[PDB]
Design a protein around this ligand. Sequence first.
Ligand SMILES: [Ca+2]
Ligand SMILES: [Ca+2]
Ligand SMILES: [Ca+2]
Ligand SMILES: [Ca+2]
Lengths: 275, 275, 107, 107
Amino acid sequence: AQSVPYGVSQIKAPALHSQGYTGSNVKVAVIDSGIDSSHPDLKVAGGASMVPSETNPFQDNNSHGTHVAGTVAALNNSIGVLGVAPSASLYAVKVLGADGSGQYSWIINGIEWAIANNMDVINMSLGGPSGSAALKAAVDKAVASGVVVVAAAGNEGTSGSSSTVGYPGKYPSVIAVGAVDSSNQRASFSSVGPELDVMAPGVSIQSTLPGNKYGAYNGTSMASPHVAGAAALILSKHPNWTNTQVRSSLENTTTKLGDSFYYGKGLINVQAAAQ
Amino acid sequence: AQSVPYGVSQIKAPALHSQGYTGSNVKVAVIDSGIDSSHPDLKVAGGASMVPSETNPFQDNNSHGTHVAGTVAALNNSIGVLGVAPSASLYAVKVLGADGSGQYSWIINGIEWAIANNMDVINMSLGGPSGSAALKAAVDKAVASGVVVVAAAGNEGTSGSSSTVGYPGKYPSVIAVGAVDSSNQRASFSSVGPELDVMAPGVSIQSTLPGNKYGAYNGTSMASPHVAGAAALILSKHPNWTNTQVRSSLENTTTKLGDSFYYGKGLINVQAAAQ
Amino acid sequence: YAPSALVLTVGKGVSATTAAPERAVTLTCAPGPSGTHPAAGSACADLAAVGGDLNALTRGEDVGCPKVYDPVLLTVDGVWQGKRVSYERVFSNECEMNAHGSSVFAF
Amino acid sequence: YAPSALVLTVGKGVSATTAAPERAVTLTCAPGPSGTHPAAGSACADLAAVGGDLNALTRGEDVGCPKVYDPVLLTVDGVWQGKRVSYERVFSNECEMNAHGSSVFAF
Ligand SMILES: [Ca+2]
Ligand SMILES: [Ca+2]
Ligand SMILES: [Ca+2]
Ligand SMILES: [Ca+2]
């Protein structure tokens, strides 16, 4: 059998998949630790590595990146799980090492690969607490370029009334995803502050792992590919909507949860987004 | 100037010294870490070492032993302190190393040197928590031999209603000395139990140190040479009193303080002992 | 005569123990650097830099980690300038912690 | 993969700190004995013997110390069989403590 993680469901994905919208013909770049291209519940179009000592985009020594990739396009068959956007073209931009550590200039470089190779959507489930002119310039050019940009809010829970949203998700040009449970309760580790856009399912999110394995993980990291797969379905319905239209759509049809320092606009609902 | 430590006073020594009793012609063996024989406020008759790697009885690498020796016979002049029994013949039986550590068989061997060289009084300001047939046999033969035997009660304060008196002072044939302050209050670290005989001044007892130095120390260790110098004065008054007579005398004329598990018979009073 | 000796542990978990230690090392800067630390000389150098004060170890600035939450607990116990130590911290994941000093957590 | 690392301090005083550390070492039995311990191999051997349990270190039996009270405080912090440790004890003098294990306190 194949199972549908609750998260794909929280967000109303199947409603779309019912009407023929599976993210098909859409180019999603997962910037991360790479992606096991040899797993059966994934099909990887292409990708590249900015990691100098780790140059095969298709070898995920961290597993992280494979987990994420699976939340976007886990294939739709009779085995494994189910991605949010199952027919989406997946790209492995590796900018994270085996230790899940990557220099800003690797991140930056990965973004640049994606702009040139015309990805439609980019997922960055990575982040650091300080930003920079280049990184910001980086995501800013993606957006000018027409790419939808998504990224994890951060895992620093709360801290006074100060913001705990890391980069690049702090940047207003990036959709920043926080995390909720099967109950729409924000996970505790979830970052807060005014730079948060929406929430998505990011607690015990079961996806694919390197070596034909499947397992469950927690993090704002798991929330992003929900929004990324989301963006992707909307483009399979409306392929000449601008990123602005798609962004705008996602944030104006959220189910509102708590106060916005903790939840932004609320849990996305792609069913409601695709109109 | 010369000063009289409060302790020499607590015990009424000067009363005796007033009447001509200064411990003169009496042989006191201090079994310990040796004794700086080159200090001016001490005059060392002789001694020997059972320490195999430390064979000069007159070199106190610990200072301990020098401190103690000074509580028995610090000379009586116009400098330093004043021993309890100032004209006493002092012997350095070293059985303690620089680290103040000595094997039982060294202790034992030291006792044996003292029996053969006819000491009248022996001071053992040493102890361990377990005893042995030989050690016990050791002090038992001293006493049969006619030597007065004195030793520190131990520094393990209290512990239930169990005894904390170490060896050789646990042995009934050894007078075991606990410690009081200038207020006749028992020092806290002082061992308790039914094997305690009497108390003596053992808190901040100023005596001689190696290198013409003088300083103050604390311990049941400092209490013993009070009783040892004590024994010694009584023999300068009554030189053919048995050790039994001298022991008996010391314990029957104590000033009674608290309950005997904490104070035995109380603070000795040699003035009262010499009759 | 720098009285200096530390020991470092790390395990998944949010607290000291209700979180086993899966890795443990010792470092010593005094007089010179040694211990079980696949990076002694730098750590000493690190602490020296910050002059032994955990709480003041510039994180990263230009390093990003995966936004997964697999909390890790760091314990440090010993002396520094014959000053005692008993620090413990929790990082959201293990990359965070590694981006933390430079080499203290070079572990 | 014995997760093992200790650090040992010792200063005059009756408590952790309101009693500086004047000496400090580190020991490691895992896999083999090392550290700053002018007697590693035995200590490991010691703890092994008692299987890492301070509280069970036969004192002396046939060694005597001077009956002076100069209290010394012993601290031990680390892991043993990836089991945490945080022991501290006060010996009436420094000879006592040395007569304590065999070599743990070989310091
Ligand atoms: Ca599948
Ligand atoms: Ca933002
Ligand atoms: Ca004098
Ligand atoms: Ca007795």
